[PDB]
Amino acid sequence: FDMGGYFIINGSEKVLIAQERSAGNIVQVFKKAAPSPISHVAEIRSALEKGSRFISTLQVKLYGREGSSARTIKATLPYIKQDIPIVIIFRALGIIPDGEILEHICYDVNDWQMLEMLKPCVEDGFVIQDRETALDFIGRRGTALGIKKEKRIQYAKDILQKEFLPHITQLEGFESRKAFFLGYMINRLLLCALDRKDQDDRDHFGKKRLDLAGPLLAQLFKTLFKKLTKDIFRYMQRTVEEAHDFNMKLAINAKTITSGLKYALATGNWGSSRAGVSQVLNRYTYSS
Amino acid sequence: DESAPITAEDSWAVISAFFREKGLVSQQLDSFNQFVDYTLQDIICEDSTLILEQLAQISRKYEISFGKIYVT
Amino acid sequence: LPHFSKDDYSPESKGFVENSYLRGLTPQEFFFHAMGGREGLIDTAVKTAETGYIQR
Amino acid sequence: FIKRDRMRRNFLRMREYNEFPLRAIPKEDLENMRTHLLKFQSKKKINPVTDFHLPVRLHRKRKTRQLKVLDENAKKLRFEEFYPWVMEDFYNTWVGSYEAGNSDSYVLLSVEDDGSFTMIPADKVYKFTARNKYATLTIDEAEKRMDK
Amino acid sequence: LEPGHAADQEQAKLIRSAIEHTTLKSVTIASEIYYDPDPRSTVIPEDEEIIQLHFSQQSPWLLRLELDRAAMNDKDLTMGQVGERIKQTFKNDLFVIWSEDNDEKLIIRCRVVAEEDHMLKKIENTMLENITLRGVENIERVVMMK
Amino acid sequence: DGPTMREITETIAEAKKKVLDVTKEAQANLLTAKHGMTLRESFEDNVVRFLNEARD
Amino acid sequence: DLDLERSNRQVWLVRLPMFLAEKWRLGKIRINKSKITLLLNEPHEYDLELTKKVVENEYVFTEQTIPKKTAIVGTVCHECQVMPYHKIVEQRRNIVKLNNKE
Amino acid sequence: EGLVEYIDAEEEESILIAMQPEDLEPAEVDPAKRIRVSHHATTFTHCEIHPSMILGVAASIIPFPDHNQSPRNTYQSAMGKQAMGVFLTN
Amino acid sequence: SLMSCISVGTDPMPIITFLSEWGMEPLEDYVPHQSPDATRVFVNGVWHGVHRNPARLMETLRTLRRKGDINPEVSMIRDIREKELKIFTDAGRVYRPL
Amino acid sequence: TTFRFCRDCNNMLYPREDKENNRLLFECRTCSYVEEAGSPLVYRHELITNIGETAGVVQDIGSDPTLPRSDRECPKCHSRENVFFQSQQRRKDTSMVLFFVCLSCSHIFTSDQKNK
Ligand SMILES: [Zn+2]
Ligand SMILES: [Zn+2]
């Protein structure tokens, strides 16, 4: 009758309680009932399926309250300080004309309201009309470690090809696809601003993801493996730099993985980030 | 006949055929087994290659990479 | 619930429990009754947690 | 109204056309030239190269022992060729960019004088954009003009 | 209320109509801007009737708007007293016309002494938000209770 | 008793007919809400009032 | 020294299925006057759809600041797409969904 | 053989589930039984295996929880995790 | 609940490969003026392209989903009003048999 | 409100007043493309919005199993097989007037007896 499904550390039956977190790679929109100039926020936590565990999150903000005019749209970018308008980003993605921008954002020519609310963004997008001036604009706005302009325009382009939207892919040439997806997010933001769709619910259980031993030990074993590789390479550089003999017993250590897995599955912490994950098994009865 | 509609009580049988297959605590066993099967090879293979760059004055290099992991 | 139709404003589908505790309750009513019970417990817990601070 | 637990005894007691051939061009011409595609982004329907006038020109514009990261092949060869080409006269400008995704499966059926066709596998595909129609810009002048 | 004017609904309707905040945007169905260069003559064939009556150097750009008659009823208003309010708001820089209550379509038109459109659009915001037709500030939804 | 159970069934049934009638009049846009609330608020107040009246 | 050879040549672009495309990495097209097919060598016949009738602003060039030898081929004449014993191809398409790892 | 399918909370938004099979699927009373709904809906795509499965492990020990109020089911579900018994034989 | 389980995650590559064989137009070739009534296809939130026939395609994916080819843990939704078709094959989702 | 775009430039056409002939025009400030005006209208705000209530109507709306079924006949084809749903415009002051969608001619006829 022993159901199993637990671990044994130091003679103690430890159980990894299922954790709960939110999902990613889904466009979300929310309202702001505060006196902040932002009325609606279009958040989207982008991350790859396996590896690195990305935390970068894109945000498309809509400025200007209801009733007042000149309601522009500005979306933030990672590693870039101030926010950048959506149309300027469209110029940095290779799309120069504005009719194509309105063709990517709004997919219905009959609707005049969304296109009407696009006007101020088409004005600021009239101020900056070139793709090269847009790449130099994002190069001059955020990340000032490039110093040289010739390396900050190509560096900004590499940001738009790699860090910008980590999902889908990170190769060069996928700017058209990301332009269509960006216009889709703007279509969801403005479409939520026209009171045609309610605020995105976060209590929907389908948008929630649980984590058992699989994901937890994936993060843990991932970080521990990275530390192991880094330490092994440290021993390599010490060996070639100090000019001595090499040994396989001093390069690859086992107490990093043993102490990491044994310590994480032994204590409540999973490294305070996370606590209370591992609990002693309650043997009061069978239903307990 | 064999093509007759089922009843309410009959459904219980189905539930039995469920718990005989899964068990009351099958999610932890399936997730952990999938972790041991695929997650180990994925983590080992996703970032196994590390190289040391050696300089001399002729350039030199060294490399260490991890392959198929083995569990006991 | 995914067991009724869309745009249904009938009282039975909106939370009315026409059955009694003597003859049992239907699932779509026992679920709402569970929601009301959990809401009662949470409300009592918050009222006590604030009642202590007010008392101090 | 009771749980039926005697199911073991119950179950134990109950149980006109025109045909034209295709040919593959010898691989010598494929080793000599690489076939790329052209796509314009100026909305104007016509825009032939004859109306592009002449001369048409398409040209591409101390530390101790340490650590390196790594990288692969095809991605490196595509990364080193980061100079896009341009076609001009001596004025109209067209600057193309890579498409990448439209590689996959693309076969060319070049029609010769006869009814037969010559099939050539497409190497890459590029999107040409008509550049410098209005002729204006500014850089710092626009950075100071956008601060009003 | 006062003991002398108790158990009276009309008096309470006057008090409610004297304190409940009302704005020009409340009564506004929609607004639209027109290019009409000649100050007196109007291209619009309908409004010609208004042109015939309310008339008997200025901006070529026209600002026009339409009100809900039901809003003119629920919140008791007069096209006249409204035009009075705007005239005593912007004073003489903005010429004003307003349609009659008899008109089945409530119309209001206004003009001024770069492009004129942007100026008009500013004035639109001022009209909708910054004009209070009647009632003191921060009073809403006055409920009669016995 | 039996007759009391039938009187309860008819009591609830009459309230169900009332909620169906107010529901049809609300779907036909023939009911104007009072001052201070909207159509949905007045409709929910009428339905909840009828259901609580039948339960009482 | 870029020179346009002709551009008068008319080329048709084709989006082929993966097995036949990787096989091409000869047949006889039968033009039926608005429906055209393809009789490969033993083997299948393939109807090719007129994907895009008008296909302007699209051309084809070849290659033999760093200027290189550039030659112009011909204009794109029609956008096309090859459409497809089909049960064996359907079974192979169901069979490709069986990839596993050790 | 295509006779049973898993459904999460996302797909549940686009399906119509029936409670009892032989009570809501076919098309058409003692006063001791409870009053149920009707079968006016036709586009039933899925059907519930059994409603009693919506409860957890602790609530499953409760006898006739329908006739009992919810907070008592919660209190009993909390007391079921500390009663004396026999957990294993070893 | 007694019959609730947690998904484990599969591979979205065979599905994406299988969609393009029935005429799924890639995203970079999309024109809203030439195909306004095209249904967008979403795989784990990634917009790979659209399709001008979601009925037969959805019927095919459902019939192949019930036969056991596709892992039953994958949950596919077709929002009509939103004109979308979400495909979820990620680990962490809680499902139940019906 | 329903503005046009420039040729080649494809930029929006800002309104330009013609003081010589005293008539409205549409310009592009990037280039020298100015076309005439076919209407004096330029801007329309439209405060009280009533559109969007019947949003999201598709040709395949009759195959939705989640949607209900009614027996009321169509005023056009007289078909008692139809699918009804309320307004799609989500707002507090949105009325609950039903929208009937016939499953034969695809006509959208409402149930409002006051205003039709
Ligand atoms: Zn222009
Ligand atoms: Zn009809």
mmCIF file of N, CA and C in Angstrom, chain A residues 46 53-54 87 89-91 106 130 139 145 150 157 160 165 181 199 226 231 238 276 281 283:
data_model
loop_
_atom_site.group_PDB
_atom_site.id
_atom_site.type_symbol
_atom_site.label_atom_id
_atom_site.label_comp_id
_atom_site.label_asym_id
_atom_site.label_seq_id
_atom_site.Cartn_x
_atom_site.Cartn_y
_atom_site.Cartn_z
ATOM 1 N N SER A 46 8.204 37.145 -22.243
ATOM 2 C CA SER A 46 8.794 36.331 -23.294
ATOM 3 C C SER A 46 9.954 35.509 -22.748
ATOM 4 N N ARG A 53 16.554 30.264 -19.219
ATOM 5 C CA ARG A 53 15.467 30.777 -18.389
ATOM 6 C C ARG A 53 15.393 32.296 -18.490
ATOM 7 N N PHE A 54 14.789 32.798 -19.563
ATOM 8 C CA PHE A 54 14.743 34.231 -19.809
ATOM 9 C C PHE A 54 13.701 34.905 -18.924
ATOM 10 N N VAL A 87 5.876 53.246 -33.573
ATOM 11 C CA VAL A 87 6.130 53.513 -34.984
ATOM 12 C C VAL A 87 7.627 53.615 -35.248
ATOM 13 N N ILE A 89 9.941 52.028 -33.615
ATOM 14 C CA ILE A 89 10.396 50.642 -33.626
ATOM 15 C C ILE A 89 10.060 49.988 -34.961
ATOM 16 N N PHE A 90 8.890 50.311 -35.518
ATOM 17 C CA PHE A 90 8.540 49.809 -36.844
ATOM 18 C C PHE A 90 9.522 50.305 -37.898
ATOM 19 N N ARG A 91 10.022 51.533 -37.743
ATOM 20 C CA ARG A 91 11.052 52.025 -38.653
ATOM 21 C C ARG A 91 12.358 51.272 -38.452
ATOM 22 N N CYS A 106 -3.919 47.555 -37.613
ATOM 23 C CA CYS A 106 -5.335 47.320 -37.861
ATOM 24 C C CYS A 106 -5.504 46.505 -39.138
ATOM 25 N N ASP A 130 13.305 57.747 -41.234
ATOM 26 C CA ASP A 130 14.279 56.852 -41.835
ATOM 27 C C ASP A 130 14.574 55.667 -40.921
ATOM 28 N N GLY A 139 19.988 53.573 -30.824
ATOM 29 C CA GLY A 139 21.373 53.477 -30.400
ATOM 30 C C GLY A 139 21.795 54.612 -29.489
ATOM 31 N N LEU A 145 27.195 52.287 -23.537
ATOM 32 C CA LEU A 145 28.525 51.695 -23.494
ATOM 33 C C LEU A 145 29.131 51.495 -24.877
ATOM 34 N N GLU A 150 29.077 53.861 -35.022
ATOM 35 C CA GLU A 150 29.077 52.778 -36.000
ATOM 36 C C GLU A 150 28.886 51.420 -35.339
ATOM 37 N N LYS A 157 20.873 47.096 -33.804
ATOM 38 C CA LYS A 157 20.254 46.141 -34.718
ATOM 39 C C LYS A 157 20.365 44.720 -34.178
ATOM 40 N N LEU A 160 17.751 44.302 -31.658
ATOM 41 C CA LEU A 160 16.457 44.046 -32.278
ATOM 42 C C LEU A 160 16.371 42.652 -32.887
ATOM 43 N N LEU A 165 12.223 40.320 -28.339
ATOM 44 C CA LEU A 165 11.391 39.130 -28.500
ATOM 45 C C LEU A 165 12.260 37.878 -28.526
ATOM 46 N N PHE A 181 3.863 40.410 -35.402
ATOM 47 C CA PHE A 181 3.480 40.108 -34.024
ATOM 48 C C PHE A 181 3.343 41.382 -33.195
ATOM 49 N N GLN A 199 -10.809 43.426 -19.614
ATOM 50 C CA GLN A 199 -9.444 43.271 -19.133
ATOM 51 C C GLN A 199 -9.104 41.792 -19.000
ATOM 52 N N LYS A 226 26.065 24.481 -14.808
ATOM 53 C CA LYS A 226 26.806 25.665 -15.233
ATOM 54 C C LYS A 226 27.968 25.950 -14.289
ATOM 55 N N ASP A 231 33.746 25.894 -13.004
ATOM 56 C CA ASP A 231 34.833 25.483 -12.119
ATOM 57 C C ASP A 231 35.860 24.633 -12.857
ATOM 58 N N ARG A 238 43.933 27.610 -14.597
ATOM 59 C CA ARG A 238 44.975 27.531 -13.578
ATOM 60 C C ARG A 238 46.079 26.568 -13.994
ATOM 61 N N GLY A 276 9.822 26.612 1.684
ATOM 62 C CA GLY A 276 8.690 25.753 1.964
ATOM 63 C C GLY A 276 8.349 24.776 0.863
ATOM 64 N N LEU A 281 6.960 14.243 5.263
ATOM 65 C CA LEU A 281 5.740 13.525 4.918
ATOM 66 C C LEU A 281 4.912 13.256 6.167
ATOM 67 N N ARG A 283 2.623 11.172 8.180
ATOM 68 C CA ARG A 283 2.199 9.778 8.302
ATOM 69 C C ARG A 283 1.189 9.587 9.427
#
